[PDB]
Amino acid sequence: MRALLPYLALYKRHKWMLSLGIVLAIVTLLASIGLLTLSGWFLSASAVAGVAGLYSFNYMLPAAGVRGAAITRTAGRYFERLVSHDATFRVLQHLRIYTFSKLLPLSPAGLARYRQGELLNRVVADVDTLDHLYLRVISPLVGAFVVIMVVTIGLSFLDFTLAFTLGGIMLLTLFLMPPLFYRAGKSTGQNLTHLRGQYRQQLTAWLQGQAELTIFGASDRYRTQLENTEIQWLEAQRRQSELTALSQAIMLLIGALAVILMLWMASGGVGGNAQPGALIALFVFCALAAFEALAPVTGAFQHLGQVIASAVRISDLTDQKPEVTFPDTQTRVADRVSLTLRDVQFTYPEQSQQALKGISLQVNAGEHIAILGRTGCGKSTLLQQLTRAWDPQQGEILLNDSPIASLNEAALRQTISVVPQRVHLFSATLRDNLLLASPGSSDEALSEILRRVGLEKLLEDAGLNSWLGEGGRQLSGGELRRLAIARALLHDAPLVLLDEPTEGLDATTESQILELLAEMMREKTVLMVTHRLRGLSRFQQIIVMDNGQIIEQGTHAELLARQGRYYQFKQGL
């Protein structure tokens, strides 16, 4: 319950639309009770009057209350649906923005949980469930409470005992019955979640390993237990509807008890009257209509547990410490970047050596550099600490004679343009996949890049308007790499970080791309990690190294002249 406080405070942005939608729900329910209560009284009042009371009845006042309670019930229902649906989409937008703003400062590290793609499909589902707190939890429960109180208060001007026993029955089953059924079905809802993820775990294994199961003749016996999990899963759902059937038969029995009590008690006297003629129907027809408000309260409290379970999950992610902070100072981005590294761990420690002294690289204001590592020995994590994904625990990373940590976040992204190994194709137009780099850029200047980087094929049909990503027009590694290079060229930054370019590509695209770097990024300082000895002759100051330690370094001719580690690379393997 205390988990929902951060997301209840998001309601302050839209508090008049969210409170109008609850007020309109209360008014609509009160007009339904007030119409059937007035109608019930009017029949018994006119019946006891008879023909004799025809000319001394004053039916004009009820006539103004029967048309009043009809307009506010049809217009109250129409606008309660309208207002509470607009309000629901307002908080969904504000939940998506709030979650995105909290998830971004901790994007690389605090969010890289196991099966991140499967986590994010569970993040989006939790934001949707937090959006259901207003219409599916708060409005039914607050609306029922106010309707009971107004009915109890307004019905107490006739009889305190009768109004308090009717409102006492309705208040007890609003505060005691929803908690009782949540507690009763708590155990059945726990193995229902256990058996649902067991089925998803067994289905994924049976579907992903369909090629392995068919060849080894096990696809039939592993579907047998998959359908056996469904039988147990469907059994737990049967025991969950066995309890929703009870909460609807007991709601009908409680609303019957109120009517029987109103019939029995109001005949012994309403107020001080020994025989209340038309006042029995006023109380009996109030108990008939007032229990419409209590219909959703048990299912609303049931959904509150789901909303709370989502509130802890979202708060687990968002309320993490962003390990990287950026000063709020305006700085001038330089046209030349002289990157220098001092005692920095080029690779995450392997085998827990703890004695790997950081490298001492030095990249001048215009020179290309290629760090030649070995495959599978260790993930780089050098361009991660160079884009301030995390602070370097080893040494100092100075950026143009100044520390990297003393640079504004906005000015840090304008001085470094990194192409990553995993390049993301946003589900948007090709224009939107490239305006990412430069947000203000001419449409023709945008199109010139595509031709320049060897991606003329994307301008054939609906060029710069075709939908990329899940919508369609998927790209392969050869052409998806070119888009990453295209972004780094629109993002005109003095320093370019090349992460494993030309990896997994054929020999033809690799030569077309390495020639792109050498002629496109001629005035820029690139820092490329390859473990591929192709095109390094054009990269001055090659850095060949193993075990996170620079063995030797220099220009390509110097490496071959001394006949060292680099010479064995070309000469042997």
Partner 1 sequence: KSRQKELTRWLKQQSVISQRWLNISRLLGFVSGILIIAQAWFMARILQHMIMENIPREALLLPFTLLVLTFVLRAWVVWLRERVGYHAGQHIRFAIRRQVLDRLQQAGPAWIQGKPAGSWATLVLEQIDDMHDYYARYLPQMALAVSVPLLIVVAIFPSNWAAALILLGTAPLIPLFMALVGMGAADANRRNFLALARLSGHFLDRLRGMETLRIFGRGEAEIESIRSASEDFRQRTMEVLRLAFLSSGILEFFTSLSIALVAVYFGFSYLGELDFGHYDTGVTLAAGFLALILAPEFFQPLRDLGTFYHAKAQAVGAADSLKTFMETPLAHPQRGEAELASTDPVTIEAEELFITSPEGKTLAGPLNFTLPAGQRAVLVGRSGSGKSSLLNALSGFLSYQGSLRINGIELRDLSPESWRKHLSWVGQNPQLPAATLRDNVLLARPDASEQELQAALDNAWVSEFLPLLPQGVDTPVGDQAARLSVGQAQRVAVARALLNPCSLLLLDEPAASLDAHSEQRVMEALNAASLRQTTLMVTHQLEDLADWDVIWVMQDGRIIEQGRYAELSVAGGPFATLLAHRQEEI
- Give the pairing of strands 495-499 and 525-529: parallel
Phi and psi angles of residue 392, each rounded to the nearest 5 degrees, phi first: -70, 120
d(CA 35, CA 286): 9
The encoded tokens of residue 522 equal: 């001629």
Q: Which is nearer to partner 1, 375 or 406 (CB)?
A: 375
14 contributes a contact to ligand ISW by CB under 6 A: no
242 contributes a contact to partner 1 by CB under 8 A: yes
User: Which residue of 22, 95, 135, 386 would you call a contact of ligand ISW, by CB under 6 A?
Assistant: 135
Applying the rule CB under 8 A, the residues between 101 and 160 that interact with partner 1 are 101, 103-104, 107-108, 111, 114-115, 117-118, 120-121, 123-124, 127-128
Applying the rule CB under 8 A, the residues between 260 and 289 that interact with partner 1 are 260, 263-264, 267-268, 275, 277-278, 280-281, 284-285, 288-289
d(CA 389, CA 381): 9
132 contributes a contact to ligand ISW by CB under 6 A: yes
88 contributes a contact to ligand ISW by CB under 6 A: yes
Interaction partner, residue 177 (ligand ISW, partner 1, none; CB < 5-8 Å by kind): none
Min dist CB 543 to partner 1, Å, is: 13
Is residue 25 within 8 Å of residue 83, measured between CB atoms? no
Min dist CB 186 to partner 1, Å, is: 20
Q: Which amino acid is at 446?
A: L
d(CA 224, CA 227): 5
Min dist CB 81 to ligand ISW, Å, is: 6
Q: How far is CA 18 from CA 55, 75, 115, 142, in A?
A: 48, 18, 37, 12
d(CA 280, CA 263): 7
Interaction partner, residue 217 (partner 1, ligand ISW, none; CB < 5-8 Å by kind): partner 1
Interaction partner, residue 135 (partner 1, ligand ISW, none; CB < 5-8 Å by kind): ligand ISW
184 contributes a contact to partner 1 by CB under 8 A: no
Q: Which is nearer to ligand ISW, 77 or 413 (CB)?
A: 77
Please count the other Cβ atoms lying within 10 Å of the Cβ belonging to residue 158.
16
Min dist CB 516 to partner 1, Å, is: 18
Residue with tokens 């219409």: 135
Please count the other Cβ atoms lying within 10 Å of the Cβ belonging to residue 458.
22
d(CA 90, CA 144): 24
Applying the rule CB under 8 A, the residues between 92 and 111 that interact with partner 1 are 92-93, 96-97, 100-101, 103-104, 107-108, 111
Contacts of 490 (CB under 8 A, 6+ apart): 434, 437, 438, 441, 446, 449
Min dist CB 558 to partner 1, Å, is: 18
Interaction partner, residue 132 (ligand ISW, partner 1, none; CB < 5-8 Å by kind): ligand ISW
90 contributes a contact to partner 1 by CB under 8 A: yes
Q: Which residues are annotated as a binding site for ATP?
A: 373-380
For partner 1 (CB under 8 A), the number of binding residues is 150
d(CA 130, CA 111): 20
C-alpha 213: how far from its chain's center? Answer: 35
452 contributes a contact to partner 1 by CB under 8 A: no
The encoded tokens of residue 105 equal: 């400062």
d(CA 483, CA 423): 8
- Nearest residue to the partner ligand ISW, using Cβ: 135
Give residues in contact with ligand ISW (CB under 6 A): 85, 88, 131-132, 135-136
